[PDB]
Design an enzyme around this catalytic site. Structure first.
Site, PDB file in Angstrom:
ATOM      1  N   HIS A  22     -20.022  71.676  20.496  1.00  0.00           N
ATOM      2  CA  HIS A  22     -21.481  71.727  20.536  1.00  0.00           C
ATOM      3  C   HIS A  22     -21.975  71.016  21.795  1.00  0.00           C
ATOM      4  O   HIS A  22     -21.435  69.975  22.174  1.00  0.00           O
ATOM      5  CB  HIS A  22     -22.102  71.075  19.317  1.00  0.00           C
ATOM      6  CG  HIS A  22     -21.681  71.674  18.021  1.00  0.00           C
ATOM      7  ND1 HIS A  22     -22.368  71.448  16.847  1.00  0.00           N
ATOM      8  CD2 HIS A  22     -20.633  72.469  17.703  1.00  0.00           C
ATOM      9  CE1 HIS A  22     -21.757  72.069  15.855  1.00  0.00           C
ATOM     10  NE2 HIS A  22     -20.708  72.704  16.353  1.00  0.00           N
ATOM     11  N   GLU A  69     -20.427  76.133  21.901  1.00  0.00           N
ATOM     12  CA  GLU A  69     -20.818  76.769  20.642  1.00  0.00           C
ATOM     13  C   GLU A  69     -22.327  76.671  20.475  1.00  0.00           C
ATOM     14  O   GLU A  69     -22.905  75.612  20.704  1.00  0.00           O
ATOM     15  CB  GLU A  69     -20.129  76.104  19.452  1.00  0.00           C
ATOM     16  CG  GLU A  69     -20.350  76.866  18.146  1.00  0.00           C
ATOM     17  CD  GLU A  69     -19.960  76.113  16.903  1.00  0.00           C
ATOM     18  OE1 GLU A  69     -19.159  75.153  16.958  1.00  0.00           O
ATOM     19  OE2 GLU A  69     -20.416  76.558  15.823  1.00  0.00           O
ATOM     20  N   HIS A  73     -23.464  76.486   5.974  1.00  0.00           N
ATOM     21  CA  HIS A  73     -22.722  77.743   5.894  1.00  0.00           C
ATOM     22  C   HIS A  73     -22.640  78.246   4.449  1.00  0.00           C
ATOM     23  O   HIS A  73     -22.856  77.503   3.491  1.00  0.00           O
ATOM     24  CB  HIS A  73     -21.299  77.591   6.427  1.00  0.00           C
ATOM     25  CG  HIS A  73     -21.201  77.004   7.805  1.00  0.00           C
ATOM     26  ND1 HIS A  73     -19.988  76.781   8.421  1.00  0.00           N
ATOM     27  CD2 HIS A  73     -22.149  76.591   8.679  1.00  0.00           C
ATOM     28  CE1 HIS A  73     -20.187  76.233   9.607  1.00  0.00           C
ATOM     29  NE2 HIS A  73     -21.491  76.130   9.793  1.00  0.00           N
ATOM     30  N   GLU A 113     -15.602  79.470   8.953  1.00  0.00           N
ATOM     31  CA  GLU A 113     -15.931  78.113   8.564  1.00  0.00           C
ATOM     32  C   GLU A 113     -16.751  78.143   7.287  1.00  0.00           C
ATOM     33  O   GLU A 113     -17.665  77.337   7.073  1.00  0.00           O
ATOM     34  CB  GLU A 113     -16.668  77.406   9.685  1.00  0.00           C
ATOM     35  CG  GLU A 113     -15.850  77.266  10.966  1.00  0.00           C
ATOM     36  CD  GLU A 113     -16.688  76.644  12.071  1.00  0.00           C
ATOM     37  OE1 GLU A 113     -17.811  77.130  12.217  1.00  0.00           O
ATOM     38  OE2 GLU A 113     -16.227  75.700  12.786  1.00  0.00           O
TER      39      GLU A 113
END
Ligand SMILES: [Cl-]
Ligand SMILES: [Cl-]
Ligand SMILES: [Fe+2]
Ligand code: NI
Ligand SMILES: [Zn+2]
Ligand SMILES: [Zn+2]
Length: 284
Positions: A109, A145, A231, A261
């Site tokens: 990130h 990402e 998620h 993920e």
């Protein structure tokens, strides 16, 4: 070809990540190469490197199929000098571990500005963090990402990724990984094929598929544009199955690690098999 796996546990040693990926029949995997909540770790030994490479070869994982993730501590855009340098040191170390392990990609990130510096100054600090790491290593691509955009984290706009790439001097060793949950949370719709085409036409014009080095395949427990990173298992969240049907059939996602993920690892093997089956030619 497509390479399909999950971010598996490295508990007990890095070779165990390759073994765990094999147990769910993945053709790709992700891992942390060291404790994701620590700044440093023991140097890799020749034994640990050798065991890890032998397991990757045993289970048919080349470096093109493996997408390590950096730690949670690193902020390559940190506005405070001491913390930026601590993060740059750790990120260099992550990239060096990847080179030593025979890996060629490192997913991270991009960083956060803490409302202490402008977004653009933060993005430039991140680009220069990448430049420093690339000047000190070989063979490893810095894979930015995208993010859901919680708090002061950047990377939730494709324009953020492009602004970083523009400031990276060796463009042969920078790229991006699109996490579908993060994109949906950030307001890029994926709920139909037409919305996927829209979203990735924006991606193509701002970042470019030239730079796409991986995907994270995640449904979303959070809602469209919520900017909340949570998620879900594929097809159980607010994105649904269709985006993943569309990704598996579209050749712009070929040749790169596609990494689950998703929140229930007991169905990772099912999700991998479902993704693979989408590639079978279907009759009229
Ligand atoms: Cl975030
Ligand atoms: Cl929603
Ligand atoms: Fe991700
Ligand atoms: Ni085999
Ligand atoms: Zn991530
Ligand atoms: Zn996430």
């Amino acid at each position: 070809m497509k390479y399909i796996g999950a971010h598996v546990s490295a508990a007990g040693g890095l070779a165990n990540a390759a073994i765990r990926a094999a147990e769910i029949d993945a053709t790709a995997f992700a891992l942390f190469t060291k404790n994701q909540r620590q700044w440093r770790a023991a140097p890799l030994t020749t034994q640990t490197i050798d065991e890890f490479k032998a397991a990757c070869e045993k289970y048919h994982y080349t470096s093109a199929q493996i997408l390590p993730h950096d730690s949670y501590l690193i902020n390559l855009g940190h506005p405070v000098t001491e913390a930026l340098e601590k993060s740059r040191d750790a990120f260099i170390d992550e990239m060096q571990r990847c080179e030593q392990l025979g890996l060629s990609l490192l997913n991270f990130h991009p960083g956060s500005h803490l409302m202490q510096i402008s977004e653009e100054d933060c993005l430039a600090r991140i680009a220069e963090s990448i430049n420093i790491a690339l000047d000190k290593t070989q063979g490893v691509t810095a894979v930015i990402e995208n993010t859901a955009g919680q708090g002061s984290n950047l990377g939730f706009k494709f324009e953020h990724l492009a602004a970083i790439i523009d400031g990276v001097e060796d463009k042969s060793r920078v790229g991006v990984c699109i996490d579908t949950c993060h994109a949906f949370a950030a307001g890029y719709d994926l709920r139909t094929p037409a919305e996927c085409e829209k979203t990735f036409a924006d991606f193509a014009r701002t970042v470019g598929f030239k730079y796409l080095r991986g995907m994270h395949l995640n449904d979303a427990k959070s809602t469209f544009g919520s900017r909340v990173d949570r998620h879900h298992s594929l097809g159980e969240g607010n994105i649904g199955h269709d985006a993943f049907r569309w990704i598996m059939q579209d050749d712009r996602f070929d040749g790169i690690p596609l990494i689950l993920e998703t929140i229930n690892p007991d169905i990772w093997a099912e999700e991998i098999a479902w993704l693979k089956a989408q590639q079978t030619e279907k009759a009229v």
